[PDB]
């Protein structure tokens, strides 16, 4: 694997209920790869949210965590749909490729901040 994937933006701020979209970028020639989206737990566990393509051995996919390959093939939207305040945290992507050897590389981490919606002004 020539370079690790990139993950952007470094800080994403959204209002609760709205969608939050990161981009994981991974140059490839469509040779076998798996692209993983992770969120850090409060005990420093890397927890998998979604994969491209889907892990057929995992018990199922949370519908709010979506990965979409864009037309250039290198950029992947990683979207939190209907973001919650308790989605705020630390996110990253990682890639696995096999040629000429296997490598597993993670992106730099980014922060998601999901803010409280302001009420109508009384």
């Amino acid at each position, epitope marked *: 694997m020539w370079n690790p994937p990139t993950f952007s933006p470094a800080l994403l701020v959204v209002t609760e209920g709205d969608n939050a979209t990161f981009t994981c970028s991974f140059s490839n020639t*469509s*040779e*076998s*790869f*798996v692209l993983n989206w992770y969120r850090m737990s409060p005990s420093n566990q890397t927890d998998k949210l979604a994969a491209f*393509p*889907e*892990d*057929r*051995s*995992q*018990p199922g996919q949370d519908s709010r965590f979506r990965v979409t390959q864009l037309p250039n093939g290198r950029d992947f939207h990683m979207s939190v749909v209907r973001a919650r305040r308790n989605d705020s945290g630390t996110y990253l992507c990682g890639a*696995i490729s*096999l*040629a*000429p*050897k*296997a490598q*597993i590389k993670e992106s730099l981490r980014a922060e998601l901040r999901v803010t409280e919606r302001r009420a109508e002004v009384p």
Partner: antibody
Amino acid sequence: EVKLVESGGGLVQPGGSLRLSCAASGFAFSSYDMSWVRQAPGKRLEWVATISGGGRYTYYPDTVKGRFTISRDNAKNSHYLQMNSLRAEDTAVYFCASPYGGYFDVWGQGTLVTVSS
Amino acid sequence: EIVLTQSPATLSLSPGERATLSCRASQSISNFLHWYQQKPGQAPRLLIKYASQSISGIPARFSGSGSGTDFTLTISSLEPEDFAVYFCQQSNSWPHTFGQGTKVEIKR
């Protein structure tokens, strides 16, 4: 729910040819690598071919290079192993399988190929 | 190619006993070492990926450990359903290769 089902195994004469097929269901077929892995009596499992999701990349060990060809028909949810110039040493159960980042997490049932005159 | 050597060839154990299965690679393969279970007439079933990560749904009694050349599958307490052949497989580099297997058979 995710399934692979092989067809095609049988008796082949030495120097002869055989084509195996594997039908997939329950997942997005064109998104995954497809493979064949064989198991000869008394011998370790031997990976013999992989094809990429879109069919553009193929990989083989030297033991079958020039004799075996892996192909796929994404519209038919199938892949194939064309096996030419077979020898006694190619007698084995042939499993279709699908790897995911290095390991095989979906397998078929195995189809026996027996090379004999 | 990378040659994987499993030992012992056969483990003879009773239900309830601990099974330790070794897989040694001919060169360093970092964590690119997977484990499978196989019974007669059946395809292999994946147990452990990337040396030490347990697949969803595998019983907690199975665990993989090791990095580099020396890898271990542990079955903490054998159930009857666990008497089978176990294989390791590397994906470090091409060709992907398998060990020759360890058979876990019943003591009597």
